[PDB]
Amino acid sequence: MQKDLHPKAVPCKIIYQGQVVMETMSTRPEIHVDVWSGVHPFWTGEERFLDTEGRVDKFNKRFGDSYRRGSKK
Amino acid sequence: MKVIFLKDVKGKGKKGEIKNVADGYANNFLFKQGLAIEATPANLKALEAQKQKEQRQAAEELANAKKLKEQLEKLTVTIPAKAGEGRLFGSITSKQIAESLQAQHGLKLDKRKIELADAIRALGYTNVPVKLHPEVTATLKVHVTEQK
Amino acid sequence: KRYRALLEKVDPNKIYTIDEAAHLVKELATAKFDETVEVHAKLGIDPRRSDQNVRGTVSGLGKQVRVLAIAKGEKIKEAEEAGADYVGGEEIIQKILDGWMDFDAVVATPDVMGAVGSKLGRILGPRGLLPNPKAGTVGFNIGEIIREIKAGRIEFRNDKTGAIHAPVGKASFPPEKLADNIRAFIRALEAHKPEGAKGTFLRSVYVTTTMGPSVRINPHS
RNA sequence: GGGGCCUGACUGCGAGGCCUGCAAGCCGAGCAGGGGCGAAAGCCGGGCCUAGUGAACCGGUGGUCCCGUGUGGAAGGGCCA
RNA sequence: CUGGUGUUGGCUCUUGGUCGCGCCUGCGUAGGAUAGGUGGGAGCCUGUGAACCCCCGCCUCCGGGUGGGGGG
Numbered sequence: 001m002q003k004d005l006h007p008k009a010v011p012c013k014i015i016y017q018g019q020v021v022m023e024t025m026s027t028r029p030e031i032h033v034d035v036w037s038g039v040h041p042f043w044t045g046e047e048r049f050l051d052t053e054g055r056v057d058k059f060n061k062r063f064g065d066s067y068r069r070g071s072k073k
Numbered sequence: 074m075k076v077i078f079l080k081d082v083k084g085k086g087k088k089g090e091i092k093n094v095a096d097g098y099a100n101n102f103l104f105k106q107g108l109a110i111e112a113t114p115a116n117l118k119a120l121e122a123q124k125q126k127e128q129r130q131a132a133e134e135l136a137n138a139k140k141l142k143e144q145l146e147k148l149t150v151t152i153p154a155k156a157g158e159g160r161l162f163g164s165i166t167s168k169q170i171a172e173s174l175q176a177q178h179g180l181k182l183d184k185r186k187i188e189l190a191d192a193i194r195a196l197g198y199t200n201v202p203v204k205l206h207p208e209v210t211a212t213l214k215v216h217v218t219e220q221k
Numbered sequence: 222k223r224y225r226a227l228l229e230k231v232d233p234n235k236i237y238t239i240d241e242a243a244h245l246v247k248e249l250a251t252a253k254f255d256e257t258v259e260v261h262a263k264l265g266i267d268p269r270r271s272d273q274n275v276r277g278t279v280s281g282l283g284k285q286v287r288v289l290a291i292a293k294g295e296k297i298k299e300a301e302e303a304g305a306d307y308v309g310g311e312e313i314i315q316k317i318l319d320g321w322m323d324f325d326a327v328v329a330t331p332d333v334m335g336a337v338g339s340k341l342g343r344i345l346g347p348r349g350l351l352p353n354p355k356a357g358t359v360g361f362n363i364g365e366i367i368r369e370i371k372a373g374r375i376e377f378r379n380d381k382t383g384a385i386h387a388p389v390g391k392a393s394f395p396p397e398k399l400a401d402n403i404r405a406f407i408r409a410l411e412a413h414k415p416e417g418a419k420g421t422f423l424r425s426v427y428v429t430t431t432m433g434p435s436v437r438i439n440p441h442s
Numbered sequence: 443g444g445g446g447c448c449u450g451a452c453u454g455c456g457a458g459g460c461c462u463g464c465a466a467g468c469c470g471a472g473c474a475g476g477g478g479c480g481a482a483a484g485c486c487g488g489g490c491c492u493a494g495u496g497a498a499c500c501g502g503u504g505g506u507c508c509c510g511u512g513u514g515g516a517a518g519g520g521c522c523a
Numbered sequence: 524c525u526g527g528u529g530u531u532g533g534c535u536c537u538u539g540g541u542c543g544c545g546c547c548u549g550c551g552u553a554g555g556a557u558a559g560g561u562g563g564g565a566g567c568c569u570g571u572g573a574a575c576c577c578c579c580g581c582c583u584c585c586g587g588g589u590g591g592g593g594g595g
Binding site for chain 5: 253254259311320348385
């Protein structure tokens, strides 16, 4: 569990697949891909209870960094 | 972005200046730096707070002023010195004014105050427009005499 | 002077009403004799495709409506006797462009209308004098058309650049009557609208008196 | 093979048979509304025939005003073509 | 490999479109056009009360103006 984001959870799930559209605008569609993948944000530097660094990602970030809920800057 | 100013935006007007210096942008440069804060219910408050405080200061002194204001405006400037038949031998410097007025009538008023072309020397009844507080002061009656 | 006078009497950004505007038109044209009031405005369409061409007539004339008859011979005769008034040919066309305009209504015999639309298009198309077909004024029955003129129709037909216009209020005809026909035109044209035409119909709508001030109005009141 | 006007080279239908393991495919008097040819008896539901061809779905578009996921609407759909 | 977006903040230099407004502005050969054109005709008989007609010089082929001088 070393990839997440401290404030909340955001790694995982994510199943993509492509097709060849062209539908509600006269005639149906068609199905293709069948794949799974990653998907996330971004981490950075701050500190908790005597050093630590943090990590977390974008969102939460803008947040908890702006402030702090279980450690600080 | 609720840019809570603590100086510049131009040069330093740390007054009522919350600008939209947007996101991580303003965010990090500006306040990481250390030149203000984000709204923070705590600081929206802050600002309204210390501003209030200065307001008390201002109106307030307006008052200290006014009290000393009408009282003195009413009274009479009584000053005794030496001379001949028109102008004292040692010139009147309102410095001397203060020394005296405070010394004998009791109130405490500056020096840099008043309005004076310069030292006067032709006795008694001559009055001085004397600045006192930044928008109101007292033009008053001054009398001096050679107690002879 | 004559016009700074007028220029301060109306405004630089407001859409008044038909009766009201009227009161101002008269307010403005004290001028010599009387200054005929008309309506002039913009048709959101396009003229480069005969399909939108908004033309025909809208609803005073009479056994009083002096008429000219544009023809080449047999039709000079026919217009004549039928009951024209000023009959002639491309010659009558050139005189009208030169400095002649007496006829009230003008008819043309489908063998000179090219002449009628191009020499005097800009001579007849203001007050309405450019022989208008499915608008009783053009036809091998020039005599027939001149005979019918009377009833009380005053036409309209979009100019190549998009503005339509004509007489909607004598500067003297009661501000009520001014509102009356201004409105009626709102109707006739408004409807006249061309089929394949979208966007927003009545762009800029103004009333005035040829030479002078032009007030923009809301042909919905 | 020509001329005359005309267009049923129509909808709603068809009793009853051909060929048929399937769906097809094919045929038709008469009946109704509505025409057309003649004076009329009557023919005319494409063509002298037997080839000029095709599921079911999946979608479009010109009517329907049946369904419309709280009811009033409409997306959307059912049927006609 | 590649357009938009995210933490990728400041400073200044710059050319493009667009609608809006503000005044510009021409050629289908005396009936196919006058300063384009459609609504006109060049004023249906015309407009600040300074250049009014006659007269030089100044601004993107010019009127907008032009300084007037001049003025029945």
